[PDB]
Amino acid sequence: EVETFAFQAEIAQLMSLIINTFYSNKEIFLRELISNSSDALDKIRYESLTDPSKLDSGKELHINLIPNKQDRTLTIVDTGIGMTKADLINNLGTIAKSGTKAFMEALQAGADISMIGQFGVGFYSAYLVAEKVTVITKHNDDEQYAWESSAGGSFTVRTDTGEPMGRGTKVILHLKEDQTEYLEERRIKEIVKKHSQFIGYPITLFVEK
């Protein structure tokens, strides 16, 4: 059972700008997604200080990077706080409505796409390199869900029947045909060292076989 939703208008406007603007510095998408994972990890870490049972769904706090050349996917997995159904349908869009608006006004006042994270909307940089993004997520207080969008103005949410995650978020980037460099081991390592060397959780690259 799949429900389809319209993006908030400002978010749809930003996603169309990201897909259609010539901008060669696409590697920042990985910094932005890792930063989002770090924020999610901070949140469950903080909550666990006063309620240790919040880690019953998994004590390890980490980020895994999983390239798959056969599927042309790059997957970013974290064991952070996860997202509820209300997060997926209402809350994140409400917050991104205002941040997207500000970011676009900034893009007219000298800013470039690389400052997107200062407006809290770094997630959408995924669409620099992905034609479709699937987000599998599990929050302690809700069931496991799959969110997905190929942009174009809409996204879907469904309960997820796949492998249970325990707790956290898995962002699956279905890469554009000309963006497969982000599946290469040495390219991912270079980007992580360049942009994400100070993240306070272990980032593990899964090597393909």
Ligand X SMILES: N#Cc1ccc(N2CCOCC2)cc1
Q: Which residues bind ligand X (CB under 6 A)?
A: 7-8, 11, 83, 88, 92-93, 96, 123, 135, 147, 155
Question: Least distance to ligand X from the beta carbon of 114, Å?
Answer: 19
Phi, then psi, of 108 in degrees rounded to 5: -100, -5
Contact (CB, 8 A) for 113 and 107:
yes
Closer of 11 and 175 to ligand X (Cβ): 11
Distance CA 83, CA 87 (A): 6
Question: Least distance to ligand X from the beta carbon of 186, Å?
Answer: 28
Closer of 172 and 192 to ligand X (Cβ): 172
Q: Is the dihedral of CA 123, 127, 130, 132 positive or negative?
A: positive
Closest chain position to ligand X (CB)? 93
123 assigned binding-site residue: yes
Question: Least distance to ligand X from the beta carbon of 74, Å?
Answer: 16
- Going through the chain in order, the beta strands assigned E by DSSP cover 3-6, 63-68, 73-78, 130-138, 145-149, 154-159, 168-175, 203-205
Closer of 35 and 180 to ligand X (Cβ): 35
36 assigned binding-site residue: yes
97 assigned binding-site residue: yes
Question: Least distance to ligand X from the beta carbon of 207, Å?
Answer: 27
| 8-state DSSP, 204 | E
Tell me the HSE value of 94 on the side-chain side, using a 13 A CA sphere.
6
Residue whose C-alpha is closest to residue 99's, from 114, 118, 79, 77: 118
Closer of 6 and 52 to ligand X (Cβ): 6
| Binding site residue list | 36, 78, 97, 123
Residue ranges of the binding site for ATP: 36, 78, 97, 123
